[PDB]
C-alpha cells in the first residue's frame, strides 16, 4: 500500500502543493526537480495539482502528519512542563504527603498547569520494580531498601519534637524529661516506617510513658492534641504542618532521639529522563536545605 | 426425659465434628466419648464429619448451650473510674479523625485510667480478633460482620464539596457545571466506603479534571488550603477541616448516596460490662 | 465447666423453679426425688430456690434454652412454610423465569410470606455440583445434562408458535408457510438452550427467512413486535406472557418443529428434604398439566 | 530531508517490534529489512524489542502514518436504501429492550434491506472485535474503551421505584420509610451499571426486605403485575414497562447516582459512511 505510494518526499513537495503554487519559488525553496516528482505524484495519483478537491483532501492531512515528524524535532531530551499532560507518580508517607504536596501543587499551578500528580505509600505494590518499570517516577523519605539501581539526593534532616495544645494547663517549652514522663501521651506506632523505633529508644533509655492512646497513623494527632491534654512525640515537619491550624505548640524533645533523613529517590534508568529531571529539580528547589 | 450431658458433648462433637477429636479438649478419653456417641446415636435414633439431621438439631442446641453458659459464667466487673483496661477499636482514618478527639476528651472525665488503641479494619482478621477479644469494637462500613455480630447504626455520611474560603471561582451551592470546570483532588481510599465515589462520578458521566490523586485523607486540608483545588469529602471530615485549614463546603451538585457508619461488637461480648459501657459511650457521643 | 454443672435434668426441675413453687405437685408432675436434686442444685449453686434474684436470672434463660430442645420436637421431617425464613435457589432460563415466577410469587404471598426466593440461569456456576451441595434447590427446563444423581418430573410440553402484532397489515393466523417465508423476522439465537436448533431445523427444511434482526435473548421481542411488522418464532409460554401486554397475536407454526419438554429437577440427596418436597409440590400444583 | 519509506517500515518495526519479524508481513526479506534498520539507526543516530527514544518518536509517527493512510485509502460507499450490510451492535438487555424497538421501527423506513444483530458486551473481547469490524457499535457503560475509541454520551439513566397501579400501599412519591416497609424484587445484573444499586442501597444503610432476587430484567414487568412487590429500575425500562404491565413509578426516595449511557465506535471506523450513518441515527433517536 504505502510501499506503492512510494516516495513521500513528494508529499513534502505536496506541502508546497498544500501551500498554493509558488512553484518556481517552491522549486528554488528546483522547478525541474519538482516537475518530474510532481508529475510522478500524478502518475501515482490521477489528480492534476490547478487545485483539485481531493488535492485539498490531501493537502491538510498531509501537513499534520508531516508536521508531527517535524513536531518530532523536539527530541526525547525535550520536555515542556508548561504544556505537558504527563502524569507523575510519587511514593511517600502520610507525613511526606502532608508536607510535600501543598507547596508542590502550589508551585505546579504556574509551572505545569496541565500535568497530573498521583501519590502512593512506599508499600502499595513493590516499589523497586515499579520504579524500574516507570510506574513510579520518584520516591521520598528514608527508604533504606533502595540501594543498587537507585540514585538518591538528600533533601533535609528533621528531629522529633514534642507537641501539645497551646493553652495546655501545664505543658511547657522547652519541656523537661520529668514533665514528659508525668504527662499523658498519644503515640503513633507508624508500622514499617522510620518512626517505629521511637518507643524502643525511649523504653531502652528508662523513660516510662503513660500511653493513653495509640493510633497506627498521624491523621488524627492534630485534632486529638487540640481537644485533649495529651502530648505527642512527632516528626518536626508534621509539627510544622499542624501548629497553626490546630493551635499547637512544639518543644525540643527532652529525650535523646536520632534525627530523620528525608531523601529524594529515583531509578538509574531515569537519571537522564527530561521530565523526571525537571520534577527532581523542582523538588530540590522547593525542599532542599543544603545552602541554609 | 433424656440426659443433657450428652447434649453438652454434642456442641464439641460439632466444633470438633472435624473429628480431631474433641475428647482431648474435653478431658475425656476417646473411648468414653465413643460410648457417649453411642448414647447419642441411640437417644437420637440417628447415626451422626458425617452430619445428618443432627445438623438441623445442632443450631437449636447451640442456641441452647449458649444462653445457659452465659447465664452461668460470672462476668468481669467494670469500674470506669478505676479501670486500667485497654480497649482495641477498629476504624478508618476518617473514623479515627472524627471519633478519637471527642472520645478522648470524654474519656478524660469519665474513665481516666483506661487505655485506647486503634487499628485499621483489615485484616486481623477482624472477625477472628473480635471473636478472641483482641479487638473490642469496630466502626464504619463492614459488610462481613453479620453472623455472631451485633450492630448499630451511629450515623450517615453525606458527601459535600470542599474548597478554600477565598477561592476565586468556587461558589456555594456549587453548580454541576462549575464542578466539572474546576480542578480536583482525588482520594482513592481503597477498600473503604469512600473508595467508591470516583467510580460513582465516573459512571454518572461527570467529567472531572483530576489534578491530584492521593490514597488517603491526611493531606486534603493543607492541600485545599494552598491551592484552588476542590475535593469530594464526607461531611464530618469537612467539619473537622473547615476551621483549622480555612475551608468552606458546598452541597454536592452530583447525586451521591449516603454511607451508613455503624458500630459493631461480637455477640460473645454483648453482656460484657466494659464493652457495654464503651459502646454506650459511642452511642451517646455520636448517634444521630 | 458445664461438666461441673453436671446434671441439667435438674435444670428441667429448675423449670419447675422457673414456674414458682407448685412443689408437691411439681414432684408429682416426686417431692423426695425433687428434694435431693434441688438440694443438689443448691450444693451446686449457693442460692436457696423462696425465689432469689439470681434464681430469676436463671429461670428464664433456662427455659428458652430448654425449650429449643423441645422446640426441636419438630423433626428434620418438619417444615413450616407459613413461618419459614429459608431462602430457595431456583435455576431457570429467562423464559422460565418470566413464566414461572409471577404465579409462584403470587401463590407464595399467602402460603409462605417470610421465605426468600432467588433465581439463576442454568450456567451461573456449575449446576450439578451446586445442586448436590444444596446451593441450588431446584432446576426447571429441559436440561439433558442432569442425569445420574438427579430425579425429574414432567411439568408440561409446549410448541413453538409464530407471533406478531395484532394489527399487522398482512400477517394471518393460522399463518401459511408462504407468508412465513415472505415476511421479515426477528430471531433469537438463544445460545446453549433448547431453542437454538430452530434455525437449523428451518434451514434444513428449505425454509428461507429474511432475518431483519437477531438478538441473543428474549427480553426485547415483545416491544419489537409491537412497534414493527416483524414476526417471530417463539416458545408458546413466552407468547402466553406477551400476548395481552404487548398487543400480540400468535399462530400455530406453519413449519414442522419439535415441542419443548419442561421438567422439574432436583438432586437425589434432597429427594426427602421437607422444604424441597414442599416447594416441589407447589410447582407441581401450579404448573403440571398431567390431568388436563 | 530524510527518506520517508523507512518511516513506513518503522510502524511495523513497532507492531513487530516483537521481532517475529515484520518483514514476512512486509513482503520484504529480513536482510533487506536489516539494511533498512541500518538506514534507520543511522538516520536517527539511535540504536533501536529493545526500544529507545524511538519509543518517544513512535507515537508522533504513528500519528503521522494514520492520517496519511486513511486519506489515501478509498472508503466503502453506503446507500441506506440499497445497503444489504449487517451491523453488529453490543448492548445490555436493558439497552436491547430500550433501543431496538424504536430503532427497528426507524430502519423500516430508512434502510429496509440492512440486517441488525445484537450481542452482549462481554466478552468478544469487545475491543478486539470492534478493532476487527466484527462489532460496529457499542452502547452503555463501558470503561475499558478509551484508547482507539471515540465515544459520545446518549443520555443518563435515572433510577425510579416501580410497582403495580392498584398497589394497596405504595404511593408516589414514595417515602424512604415506606420503601423499607414494602417487599422488593432484586435484579443482580452482574457486571452492568445497574448491578451496583443493591450495593449502594446496602452501604446507605437502607434496610430492604428482599423477597425475590433475579439475575436479569426480563421478568420484572410480569412479576410486579402479579404481586405487591416493588422494584428499583432505570427510568427507561420503567417507561418500556408501565403501559404493557399496568405499572406506575415513583421518584426514588434514596439518593442514587445517574448512569451515563454512551455510544462507542472504534477510531478506525470514524470515517466509515455506514458506521457514521447508523451512529448518527442513534444520536438522532436517543440523545437528550
Numbering used by the authors:
A (entry chain A), C (entry chain A): 1 to 29, 33 to 52, 61 to 303
B (entry chain B), D (entry chain B): 5 to 52, 61 to 300
From the paper:
apo-DntR homotetramers adopt a compact homotetrameric configuration. well-defined electron density for the wHTH regions. apo-DntR they cannot bind salicylate and DntR cannot be activated. constraints in the crystal - packed closer to the tetrameric core. solution is different to that observed in the crystal. apo-DntR reported here result in very poor matches.
